[PDB]
Symmetry: C5
Subunit: 311 residues, 5 copies
């Protein structure tokens, strides 16, 4: 078996199409996702053409080893896809119609800057290395690109599955390569983050602020220190569901900013006590009374600034 | 090897049957379940007809590669099933009786709204793609569909294993497809949740309410703060055994509601102190005395409302 | 290849034997165990008989594909066993002696009611499906059933490896089936549970009871609350090494019972304070003096009751 | 293919040799370790002997399927080794020189009595089963047993790789077996345990002892209770890196012993307070002054006793 | 198939080249990394040479089994690489051009001394064992060595991918071996460590130092003890992302040093109280006033010393 010969000096166009059957296991830390899909390929081989009159059949079914099949690979995969050939069908003119059902772990990097209010564009890169005889160029058959209705990705909303129709052909090791881009747009389901992380994290912060309505230093220390410990637990729980990013995330910004409010609340609680012991509770009272308004106002403005910068 | 030819213009009916041997590893986070079962297939291939007078044997046994076997696949699987052919038996009329024992991790979505007092309907989807020569339609052989008595799923009660007899015949990529639905009904064993999560989480809440029978603000802060920290541990322990859902779960609702009771208890504990220091313990006493009745009544009614909304 | 023909109308007896080489990875949560053992099979095939005086050779060695071998499978396995044929030897009369070394993950349910003072009976179920020509029945060759001396299972004491000699012959999908039961009796090594869980869990409880020799409510709150937090940590550490059972475990019972002692200690600590503030420390003293005797006595009796109920 | 015939009535000696290429993943909980090594085998087969004069070659290279190769297996392995044949070479006298590169997960039990100041002897057991024709005996070719210099095992110091030259010949299932022992001596790198576990665990204990220079019961309760909670965290952190042993470990002994010092410190702290309230601070002072000397002396002596018993 | 014969007595030079497609999963604890790359091989086989004028063809394509291919292996791999042959092309003179796309988990040790401000040199070792007929020597074809622009390693900056052109030729088990070194230089992205570990760990330390501006021993105990517990949580969180090293890491040094500051702060807090009770608050005040300057100065200098020693 060898590639079909060119009629003139034109490259062989292999029409592609991916139809997603099952979408699952999106690892945020590993920036991977597992896919189960159909792969449809179509090319013209004149050597396989026949007259439907003499042959007595309008279509001929072949085994993979019997005829020449182009070496189609995925760029961003962990290991080689678990392919299983469904059907190979030849038309009288010699147009081969290949179909296989595969499963692979895809390496698609994620952008956590707006986490957990982020949207992602997952990529599937189809590639073909040109042979010495003739060059192979990929094309998108929009009729054979899709996803079924039951495709669900846990914790994500599947927006669309499209393909960049124009391939990005390039030279690699003195041979041509045709690359295609299959984009799967998704958006995070941030609902669970509100009652599990955001709201309990805010309650522990407001509970620490009840120290501006107390003169008991021993109770204030317990209030601001204990709630800080709960924030450390929340900061740890968050950084376990996320990878180490060289940029600041939206949640990461808020979490880090809250570590300063706890630090300033400790300073205020110490100042109030030092002034009380120094027999000047008039200054201690005015600082405490100011903090009652300062802390919520600065916190609310700081969040408006952050949310503005991130969105 | 090619498909059997039609006597008239009828599609080939492949009679199916799944018999569950072992049911294991139900992942709640991944919404998967591993199954070890028998798969029985039956189709008429007249091309395999024989005379037992001549051949010597009443029933003929073939190897999988020897004869044509229909390409039966599962829709909702992670990877291709680990199949092992048990027996292929052809009768003189050509009726093939296929039997294989497989193992696959099935992708069946779960509903955690009533967790841990929820019931699920797990699905197994058999599918067959029609060939160019003739169409293939699936059928259920109710005699060969079941599960053995020893089938146990850890933490679950296995109700039934049935099949939707009428197949879903639909067009996919210009070819006909026959889909079958194998439903496995299960219900959760909620017993362990009561002494491990529900009751210890209630004890820590009632312990916080002993602050309504105390005038010691420093002891009250320790009481309401420390028990809130224990409740954060309980909220974390629960959200680790569950996936991030875009809906509110029953336990998630209760856990979140308890966060408000700790927040209001902190306000009461602060109010009582502020009034005591302001030299008006008559107001502080009446608020504290009211909270002794208010907190248990509101909590009891709020739970009746939630349980009503969820069930 | 086809099954040996019956001399009369008797079923083919396949003599079995499992010899455990390596026993490892007992997962308590998954109720699985990995095994590496020898499997010996023996049946009579007259078609393979030869004259000992003529042939010269006493025994004939065959390849697996050359001769007919019965399809022996395991019922309670995750996936198909990793078998490797060691030797196939035929006697002059036609008795075949098969030997293979396998490795499989076995699904054997566990009983945690007496945990960590529990004993288990692990099962290995051999099964054979009868063919259309003749029926196949399993038998135990007690000479070829065993385990080597070096077989160690981490955290467990291996008692015995026996087989239920009488097979379970039953009908499944219109064909006969012969099932064998290989039982491996083990008992847990509870030594590590005493200094790591039981004794530290008792020390934290007795430390909470030092609040019956204190009048300082602020110190008593710290004592009873802080120790409860440590007990929650132990309750969590325990439920992570165990699966969700629909029954009460022995440790689970003790752990849950201790939650009540903390709850009553909190009530006593609150009562003592309420009476002190109410200017009647005579009642507060008598309640505190009684609890010094009540708490250890009730705890000691409650444990005798539990241990009695469980053992 | 069949085994070489004996010249007299001598058993076939297969000369072995393992050369470790890569040593990795020593699981302490699972008592396993992965290996990547060369396996060299050598036996005399007269049936393959040739004259180098007429052949015109000093050596002859064969494929594995072409000639008879002895079935060499490993006793203590999880699954069958991932073998890849490097070279098969035959000398004119018929001496076969086999070489393969394998990878296997070895089951070698560990002794944690002196942990983390322990040394281990890892085992690799080569085994050969004798055939009906003639018996097979293993031998060590010390020239072909080694390990490369770059062999590193994370957290361990690799001492030596030697083999017990005399094989253990024994009967198993009516057939003779030749077993060889390849011992890999290693010793733990205990450096990381000192600043991460030992020293931080000692600091928290000495911090608890500052309660012998304080009369504030509320502060002493906070001191001894809080530090005990940190010790529980250290006790848990340690038991997660170790399997459940039916013996006491060196670290396990120290950790458990410290639990008693925390218990006696709580008793002393309670005694001091009870005596203070009972208006006899002269007794309370003498007990507190004694504990300042008693606690460090008893702790220092108790450690000398333990270290002596363990080493 | 056998190796090409030497024209004189020269060894066969196999020109190599690795082109990295995907770089992923760098395990710090396991000191491993998964790669997906192209492997290009080139050698001269005169037995395959042909005339380009009469043959009409300039290049001839062969199957792997058709022609002799050198046994190229990787030294530092877990298991054998998942290779898939892309193309085999022969030139008129007999120069073979092999290309395969592989995936393997590489064992490359890491240096954590400057963690998380460390840089690593990952290694890939190509090796070839010489045959009895002739010796095989490796060479680097710098034209076919590279990495694509999209190669991303989570949490790391990929500097370069180069190869040590001169191979290490050495004797192993009486046969010659040729080894090549492919070095992949990377540097850690330390950005995430600052707001998640470094800065929160510093805030809790400075919060403990507010005890130098307080006379309340009960509040000082709460301050220094509670913050130390948070530091233990940070020490644990760090030692989980790192393997047990026989050397001191930069973070490990800082974390351990901070343990001493908490220990000295506890001593100061005890000294201040003992002097206050001893009715000499003039000495207690001067010690407390000195510690206000001492603790930040000593900490700042100690860090300059450490950073100097490590960098
Ligand atoms: Cl691929
Ligand atoms: Cl280009
Ligand atoms: Cl090109
Ligand atoms: Cl399937
Ligand atoms: Cl099996
Ligand atoms: Cl093996
Ligand atoms: Cl390799
Ligand atoms: Na082909
Ligand atoms: Na077939
Ligand atoms: Na306190
Ligand atoms: Na057979
Ligand atoms: Na052989
Ligand atoms: Na070859």
């Amino acid at each position: 078996v060898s590639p079909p010969p060119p009629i003139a000096d034109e490259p062989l166009t292999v029409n592609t199409g991916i139809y997603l059957i099952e979408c699952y296991s999106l690892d945020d830390k590993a920036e991977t996702f597992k896919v189960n899909a159909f792969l449809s390929l179509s090319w013209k081989d004149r050597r396989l053409a026949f007259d439907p009159v003499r042959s007595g059949v309008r279509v001929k079914t072949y085994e993979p080893e019997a005829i020449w099949i182009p070496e189609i690979r995925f760029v961003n995969v962990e290991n080689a896809r678990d392919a299983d050939v469904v059907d190979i069908s030849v038309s009288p003119d010699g147009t081969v119609q290949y179909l296989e059902r595969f499963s692979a772990r895809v390496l698609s990097p994620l952008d956590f800057r707006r986490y957990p209010f982020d949207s992602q564009t997952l990529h599937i890169y189809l590639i073909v290395r040109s042979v010495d005889t003739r060059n192979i160029v990929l094309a998108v058959d929009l009729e054979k690109v899709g996803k079924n209705d039951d495709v669900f990705l846990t914790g994500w909303d599947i927006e669309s599955f499209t393909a960049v129709v124009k391939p990005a052909n390039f030279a690699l090791e003195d041979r041509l390569e045709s690359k295609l881009d299959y984009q799967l747009r998704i958006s995070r389901q941030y609902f669970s983050y509100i009652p599990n992380i955001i709201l309990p994290m805010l309650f522990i912060l407001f509970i620490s602020w009840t120290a501006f309505w107390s003169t008991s230093y021993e109770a204030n220390v317990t209030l601001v220190v204990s709630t800080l410990i709960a924030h450390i637990a929340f900061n740890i729980l968050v950084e376990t569901n996320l990878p180490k990013t060289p940029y600041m995330t939206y949640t990461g910004a808020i979490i880090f900013m809250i570590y300063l409010f706890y630090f300033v609340a400790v300073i205020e609680v110490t100042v109030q006590h030092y002034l009380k012991v120094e027999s000047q509770p008039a200054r201690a009272a005015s600082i405490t009374r100011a903090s009652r308004i300062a802390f919520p106002v600065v916190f609310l403005l700081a969040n408006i600034i952050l949310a503005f910068l991130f969105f």
